[PDB]
């Protein structure tokens, strides 16, 4: 109320020093109701100043001057100067105009996208301000669409400068926090647009077990329902709510079998053709909606209609949930048209997410992005990406940049959805990224040739995919703790580099590089390997400090930008001196919570990690070479400790503390072994290999080893040898 | 024509000659003002070198040592002495690596890969230092030639190359710091020994004369036109040449036919990054491979 | 005028600003009180220190509550205010639409340093006469970004000397100075010769200036002003008349290294033409490719 100012037909609410709501009302009434985007305008009071005259008003905070000259909002009447110097003359917002500096957000979908597509703006800007227009409908108390806002213009001016994390936290306070995911969502999902039988699906699930690949989720795509069995007078088989009985003669029994294998089960739902007269639930729906059954009147999709939504959840989904379906894959691609003006995809995500909470605690959906605030309905489903290096090269940037509009749970089809071209190396690189993405869901097109099964590929590719898929389940504790941090504290699992390093120009120059939780920095390789090196590469920016390759221990002295090379089976993931990462020791075990945690410690500095769980909190501290583990509640959990290289403690129960000062701090990784391996795999001349090995062995001074490699005629081989010299310096 | 004259000046004989064409005269003023001035400077340098050449000539005749030696005469067991076909020793004090390839128009500089034997080497003209043993690509403007002297080198130069003198009335003793050395100047009617031993420079002759000696220690003229035999202490004289990384970096970026954004970024990053290994890591990311090599030469010399 | 500025206390008093809340005198050229404080209390003290005229350097858009382009208000009001301190005074500012020739000089701004930019500029300059904006001042040698090429800098200065205004300017780079001695001895001497030639041309330029002001004739004319019915007068975009006695065909392409010369296709109207510098003759009417060393520029005068 002191944070509220009316002037002419406008209303201004100073929510934080850095966040102002700006409204216009012809009627003099302004909007207090929630909207599709905004769930909460309750914020603690803040200091600001006002200069009010007859004709004009200026609102002044620590970061912004907002001016209003009266009348209708125009670029001339409503504008703001930030109190920052990030630019020479892009420090002014004008109503209705775009400025430079927006770091972007996300978009609905990657359907049919081969590589890059345009993104919407987010709330983050290098120049320190962004405007988020609220164009949505108002809600009722219980979250039904109520109609048009009486605030016919309703904007949020963000003026956080480059405090991106606080901008995002306050956005979550305005639009509501992301809910907690359930632990099962963070495991591997299996999916394929393939007409499995109950028998061939269970045989595939048992082959995953036999192949030592853990799964959390069993997706059944659209061939679960009638497709070619649909008479053409009704249109296509794309939408379906009736089991194909040939393939699934006893659905509940099939779902019981997946449940006995400790899998959660989801079905594809294409809702757009509604419930037509051939469907199994049609007689019930027709009775509830008073349809003309002798004229075979369809229950057309209509999520604006309360009776339709009830029949959809109770009489269409209800019978399938009773057969054991755990959650819904909402797969909408049929446009944004409704008589209400609300995007049907928005109505589906909002209502289905709420309905999912009835059957299961912290339940999810799987659906496309439905605009600002739709993070309240995880998980994101990016859809029909084209299978290409260009698509993979876009995806890490896409994923990290989405955190800028608070949409932090994108599930991409890992390996790409459709079209494009076969390349087992592309499939393996894509799975490496997926394992270090918010969700790891293997999925593919209707092709006989696009299965993401590891054993589709040669023995090298298969073993590497199996190792990465196991690593995903090892990461579930770290992922689930970051998930609770997203839900409780408004911090993204995947952050662009500029969230941690806002003032470092290099944090804006590595689009595909990101922080993954608080302990790991990932630089996926998204380019086909150089056949002369038998290695792929990516330019990595190393922030100030000592960094270790998470897998090898190879060290890097920051701050530096350095091209790094990896075999197709290895991924650039880095941890700082002092990093502590927990890993499940038993990733193949079907355990609700890990019976055994490996604490992986990176030497050379202090650190700590807080492991949040369903029913506990465990703190791991590393302070002057003393490692301590405590928990809120006690348990039988057995702790394993790995300090750099060496397993120090194995399966020790309860709370404890152990001194690692005089333990071996150094990893195995050495310049000589790594040099030999890189030269050995290279498809270069044996004379060159022999000369490089002899000269780098005989030349003692680091500066002369570098001078030697600088004479090499292969420019990319120079860069690979320079990486090793830089790490071995 | 200019690169060829640079080599000629550091060859056994410097004879300008050409065909019956109206278009092939080797007159310096045939060419533009830049080329003309550089040819005139090299042609004057040849006459400055006559004392050094004539002493090497008497050594050829009396001792059977060539003025021009392949690297493998001095370094028979070093494989790199067999891999620099155009590199040679010129007398006992100078090592020459002529540039014999058209300049890279993006750098406005020509280059040659130089093998530096064990020891500290100085560019004879600039003082730019090099720590041997190393093989390093070196870049020069078209007006400059890679000629190198070791720490301790003493080269005599005629001070009056334009004078029509039977023997020089005045010798400049050019001394390269950081080690002991000596040079014996053989002449028609004399022998003059120049010795540099724990920072003491001594000149003696077999016979006496009116000859006036000038001394240049690295950068600085220490003595001017002093007659007869003498000895002078250079220990607490300035040993370091002027050549510096910053000036050389600015000059290379300024002449380059590259983008001004690239110039600005390279100048700012190499000025702001303090650790030598990170300056090298920075230049290693450059998309221009030959510009990397040019910047690496400067970092190597400035290390 | 923000609270840290030296004239702020005076402006704040005149505009009744809240100084304890450090209320800015925001730019507002629609406002008579703002314009007066700007000319009297902001420019005024600098003019008393000796500033002769104003470089108005506006790049912040066309937004005003009046709907009048702020650049238009600046050029109209500053040009008028400049006449108080000096007779026939000028500004230096961007083009503000038809009629803004009343407020010379034009300032074209932040061109990219490239052969492509130089290749555009003569056409740009001559074509502007078609909306009566005859005093464009371009940054000679180009403003920013682009790439180093001493030959581009020399060709650009040749055009500049035969342009309405010869203003050397460049970016914040340590590497973009237009000083002649930045370049090698050949380039330096040629730049010095062209810069001296500009001052030799001042009588011819000042007489054409009075003709612009009294008779409405541009200094720089496209060929089709003199030769409206000749198809070739529409096919030499970079060729122009410079006053009434000279025809200029600048070279705006990098030299052919095999010839050590640049070239341009010149249309010679009916009559006998001489290269202004060399006397080399040409019998019109003909279209002919002409070659010059980097130090020489194609400028032609008729018999008489
Ligand atoms: O259900 C069949 C297909 O429908 C749509 O194209 C979905 O986006 C895709 O994920 C699915 O496999």
User: Tokens representing C183?
Assistant: 């370049």
Element (H, E) at C72: helix C70-85
> Residue A321 half-sphere exposure, CB side, CA atoms within 13 Å?
19
Q: What would the 3-class secondary structure string for A137-187 be? A: CEECCCCCEEECCCCCEEEEEECCCCCHHHHHHHHHHHHCCCCCCCHHHHC
- Cα separation, A123 vs A37, whole angstroms: 13
Rounded CA gap, A222 and A271, in Å? Answer: 11
Whole-number Å distance between alpha carbons of A633 and A618: 9
**In A57-158, where does DSSP find H-type helix?**
none
Taking CA C171 as the corner, what is the angle to CA C166 and CA C176, rounded to the nearest 5 degrees?
Answer: 80
Could you give the number of structural domains in chain C? Answer: 1
* Both tokens assigned to B272: 């702001």
Write the DSSP string, A463-521: HHHHHHHHHHHHTHHHHHHHHHHHHHH---SEEEHHHH-TT-GGGGS-TT-EEETTTEE
Is C7 inside a domain boundary? yes
Preferred mutation among B116, B118, B129, B280 to probe A, highest tally of A CBs within 10 A:
B280
Query: Is C109 contained in some domain?
Result: yes
Query: How many CB atoms neighbour CB B188 within 10 A?
Result: 8
Q: What is the resolution of this structure in A?
A: 2.0
Which of A639, A655, A656 has the alpha carbon at shortest distance from A647? A639
H/E stretch holding A93 reads: strand A92-94
Count contacts between A and B (CB, < 8 Å).
44
Ligand 1 mutation target, pool A221, A366, A419, most atoms within 8 A of CB:
A221
CA separation for the pair B91, B148 (Å, rounded): 12
Domain assignment of residue C191, yes or no: yes
Is position C142 within any domain?
Answer: yes
Whole-number Å distance between alpha carbons of A171 and A235? 43
DSSP state, A710?
A: H
Tokens of A437: 């993405």
Number of Cβ within a 10 Å radius of residue A11:
20
CB contacts, 8 Å: A559 with chain B: 278
Domain boundaries, position C177: 1-220
Give the nearest chain B residue to C186 (CA atoms): B33
Inter-residue contact B3 to B98 (CB < 8 Å): yes
**Using H for helix, E for strand and C for coil, what is the string for chain B?**
CHHHHHHHHCCCCCCCCCCCCCCCCCCHHHCCHHHHHHHHHHHHHHHHCHHHHHHHHHHHHHHCCCCEEEHHHHCCCCHHHHCCCCCEEECCCEEECCCCCCCECCCCEEEEEEEECCCEEEECCCCCEEECCEEEEEEECCCCCCEEEECCCEEEEECCCCCCCCCCCEEEEEECCCCCEEEEEEECCEEEEEEEECCEEEEEECCCCCCEEEEEECCEEEEEEEECCEEEECCCCCCCCCCCHHHHHHHHHHHCCCEHHHHHHHHHHHHHCCCHHHHHHHHHCCCCHHHHHHHHHHHHHCC
A65 contacts C24? CB cut-off 8 A: yes
For residue A188, what are the β-bridge partners? A440
Task: State residue A539 phi and psi, 5-degree precision.
Answer: -80, 120
Question: Is-cis flag, bond preceding B34, omega within 30?
Answer: no
CB C291 within 8 A of CB C298: no
Strand partners, A646: A643
What DSSP element (H or E) covers C213? Answer: helix C202-215
Q: Are A411 and A402 in contact (CB under 8 A)?
A: no
Q: In a 10 Å sphere around its CB, with 0-12 CB exposed, 13-18 middle and 19+ buried, how is residue A687 labelled?
A: exposed
- Beta strands at A413-414 and A440-442: parallel, antiparallel or unpaired: parallel
- Cα separation, A336 vs A513, in Å, equals 33
Separation of alpha carbons B109 and B138, rounded Å:
10
Q: Which long-range contacts (CB under 8 A, 24 or more apart) does A641-646 make?
A: A641/A598, A641/A599, A641/A601, A642/A598, A642/A599, A642/A600, A642/A601, A643/A601, A643/A603, A644/A553, A644/A601, A644/A602, A644/A603, A645/A553
3-state secondary structure of C71: helix
Structure tokens at A617: 């909190």
Decide whether any atom of ligand 1 lies within 6 Å of the A442 Cβ: no
Are the C-beta atoms of A177 and A336 separated by less than 8 Å? no
Three-class secondary structure of residue A538 per DSSP: strand
Q: For residues A309, A310, A312 and A313, what is the CA-based torsion angle, rounded to 10 degrees?
A: 110
Q: Say if CB B28 and CB B40 are below 8 A apart.
A: yes
For CA atoms A432, A433, A436, A442, the dihedral sign is negative
Per the DSSP assignment, residues forming a β-bridge with B299 are none
Torsion angle defined by CA atoms of residues A107, A112, A118 and A124, in that order, rounded to the nearest 10 degrees:
30
Q: Is C6 exposed, middle or buried (0-12, 13-18, 19+ CB in 10 A)?
A: exposed
Q: Do A640 and A649 contact (CB within 8 A), yes or no? A: yes
Please state the separation of Cα A582 from the chain's center in Å: 20
- Name the neighbours of C, counting chains with at least 3 Cβ pairs within 8 A: A, B
Minimal Cβ distance to A726: which of B135, B281, B303: B281
In the block, tokens 């309240």 appear at A376
First to last CA, chain B: 35
> What is the Cα–Cα distance from B137 to A373, expressed in whole angstroms?
59
Q: Answer whether C15's CB lies under 8 Å from C33's CB.
A: yes
Phi, psi (rounded to 5 degrees) for C266: -105, 130
Beta bridge partners of A441: A189, A413
Alpha-carbon distance B287 to nearest alpha carbon in chain A (angstroms):
10
> Which of A196, A273, A380, A384, when mutated, tests ligand 1's pocket best, judged by the most ligand atoms within 8 Å of its CB?
A384
Buried b / exposed e across A294-313, counting CB within 10 Å, b at 16+?
A: eeeebbebbbebeebbebbb
Residues of B in contact with C146 (CB under 8 A): 259-260
> Which residues are registered as beta bridge partners of A540?
A562
Beta bridge partner(s), residue B218: none
Q: Is B253 on the interface with C (CB under 8 A)?
A: yes
C102 lies in some domain: yes
Q: Which residues are bridge partners to B90 per DSSP?
A: B68, B94
Query: Is residue C250, in this structure, part of any structural domain at all?
Result: no
How far is Cα B268 from Cα B276, in angstroms, rounded to an integer?
15
- B27: exposed, middle or buried (C-beta count within 10 Å: 0-12, 13-18, 19+)? exposed
Exposure string for A535-565, b = 16+ CB within 10 A, e = fewer? bbbbbbbbbeebbbbbeebbbbbbbbbbbbb
Chain B partners (3+ C-beta pairs within 8 A): A, C
Decide: C64 and C29 in contact? Cβ < 8 Å. Answer: yes
Nearest by CB to residue A51, choosing from C23, C59, C64, is C23
Residues in chain C that come right before a backbone break, where C and next N are over 2.5 Å apart? none
C-alpha distances out from residue B193 to A401, A652, B171, Å: 75, 82, 12
Angle at A697 between CA A695 and CA A698, to 5 degrees: 65
How many angstroms separate the CA atoms of A456 and A449, rounded? 9
- The structure tokens listed for C260 are 């050590």
A95 within 8 A of A77, measured Cβ to Cβ: yes
What is the dihedral sign for C-alpha C167, C170, C172, C176?
negative
CA distance B220 to B232: 14
**Closest among A374, A376, A373, A420 to A394, alpha carbons compared:** A420
d(CA A134, CA A21): 10
Candidate of A331, A367, A383, A386 to mutate for ligand 1, largest count of ligand atoms within 8 Å of Cβ: A331
Residue A639 · residue A599 · CB < 8 Å: yes
Q: Domain with A305 in it: what CATH number? A: 3.20.20.80
- Residue A658 CB burial class (10 angstroms; 0-12, 13-18, ≥19): middle
Cα–Cα distance between A518 and A135 in angstroms, integer? 35
CA nearest to A58, candidates A84, A79, A30:
A79
Q: How far apart are CA A499 and CA A485, in angstroms?
A: 16
User: Closest Cα of chain B to C146: distance in Å?
Assistant: 6
CA distance B31 to chain C (A): 11
Which positions in chain C touch A97 (Cβ < 8 Å)? 63
- According to DSSP, the residues that pair with B183 across neighbouring strands are B194
Distance CA A616, CA A81 (A): 47
């Amino acid at each position: 109320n002191n944070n509220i100012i009316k002037f002419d037909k406008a209303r201004f609410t100073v929510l934080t020093e850095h966040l102002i709501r700006i409204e216009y009302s012809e009627t003099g009434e302004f909007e207090e109701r929630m909207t599709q985007m905004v769930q909460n305008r309750e914020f603690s009071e803040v200091n600001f100043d006002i200069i009010e005259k007859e004709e004009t008003i200026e609102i002044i905070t620590s970061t912004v001057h907002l001016y209003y000259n009266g009348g209708e909002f125009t670029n001339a009447s409503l504008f703001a100067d930030v109190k920052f110097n990030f630019s020479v003359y892009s420090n002014r917002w004008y109503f209705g105009e775009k400025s430079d500096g927006n770091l972007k957000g996300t978009t609905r979908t990657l359907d049919m996208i081969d590589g890059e597509c345009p993104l919407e703006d987010g709330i983050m800007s290098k120049n320190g301000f962004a405007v988020l227009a609220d164009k949505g409908k108002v809600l009722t108390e219980v979250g039904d669409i109520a109609g048009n806002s009486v605030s016919t213009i309703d904007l949020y001016l963000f003026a956080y400068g480059r405090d991106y994390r606080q901008a995002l936290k306050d956005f979550y306070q305005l639009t509501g926090n992301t809910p907690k995911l359930p632990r099962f969502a963070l495991g591997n999902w299996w999916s394929r647009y393939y007409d499995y039988s109950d028998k061939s699906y269970l045989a595939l699930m048992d082959k995953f077990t036999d192949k030592k690949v853990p799964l959390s989720v069993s997706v059944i795509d659209m061939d679960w329902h009638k497709v070619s069995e649909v008479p053409s007078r009704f249109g296509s088989g794309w939408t379906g709510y009736s089991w194909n009985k040939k393939l699934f003669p006893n659905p509940e029994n099939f779902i019981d079998e997946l449940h006995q294998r400790k899998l959660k089960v989801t079905l594809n739902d294409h809702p757009a053709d509604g419930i037509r007269a051939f469907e199994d639930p049609y007689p019930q729906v027709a009775q509830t909606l008073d349809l003309n059954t002798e004229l075979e009147e369809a229950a057309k999709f209509d999520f604006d209609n309360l009776k339709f939504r009830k029949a959809y959840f109770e009489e269409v989904h209800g019978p399938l949930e009773k057969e054991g379906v755990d959650f819904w894959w909402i797969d909408w691609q049929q446009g944004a048209i409704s008589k209400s003006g609300v995007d049907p995809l928005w109505l589906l995500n909002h209502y289905q997410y709420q309905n999912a909470q009835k059957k299961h605690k912290n339940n999810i959906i799987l659906s496309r992005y439905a605009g600002p605030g739709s993070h309240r309905y995880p998980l994101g489903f990016s859809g029909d990406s084209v299978i290409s290096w260009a698509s993979l090269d876009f995806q890490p940037y896409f994923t990290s940049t989405a955190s800028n509009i608070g949409y932090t749970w994108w599930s991409h089809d890992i390996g790409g959805h459709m079209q494009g071209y076969k390349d087992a190396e592309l499939s393996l690189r894509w799975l490496q990224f997926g394992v270090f993405s918010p969700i790891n869901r293997l999925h593919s097109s209707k092709s006989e040739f696009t299965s993401k099964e590891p054993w589709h590929f040669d023995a090298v590719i298969e073993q590497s995919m199996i190792d990465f898929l196991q690593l995903r389940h090892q990461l579930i504790p770290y992922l689930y703790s970051a998930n609770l941090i997203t839900a409780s504290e408004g911090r993204a699992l995947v952050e662009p580099l500029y969230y941690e390093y806002p003032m470092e120009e290099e944090a804006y120059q590595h689009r595909n590089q990101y922080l993954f939780g608080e302990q790991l920095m990932v630089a996926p390789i998204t380019e086909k390997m150089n056949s002369l090196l038998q290695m792929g590469s990516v330019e990595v920016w190393f922030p100030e400090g000592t960094w270790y390759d998470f897998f090898s221990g190879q060290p890097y002295d920051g701050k530096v930008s350095l091209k790094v090379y990896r075999e197709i089976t290895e991924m650039p993931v880095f941890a700082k001196a002092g990093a502590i990462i927990p890993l499940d020791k038993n990733p193949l075990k079907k355990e609700e919570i890990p019976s055994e945690i490996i604490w992986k410690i990176f030497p050379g500095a202090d650190g700590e990690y807080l492991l949040l769980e369903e029913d506990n909190e465990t703190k791991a501290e590393f302070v002057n070479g003393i490692f301590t583990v405590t928990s809120k509640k006690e348990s039988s959990r057995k702790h394993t400790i790995i300090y750099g290289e060496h397993e120090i403690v194995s399966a020790k129960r309860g709370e404890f503390s152990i001194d690692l000062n005089g333990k071996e701090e150094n990893f195995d990784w050495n310049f000589s072994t790594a040099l030999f391996r890189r030269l050995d795999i290279a498809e270069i001349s044996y004379e060159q290999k022999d000369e490089i090995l002899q000269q780098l062995s005989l030349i003692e001074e680091h500066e002369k080893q570098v001078a030697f490699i600088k004479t090499n005629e292969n420019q990319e081989l120079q860069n690979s040898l320079f990486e090793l010299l830089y790490s071995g310096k």
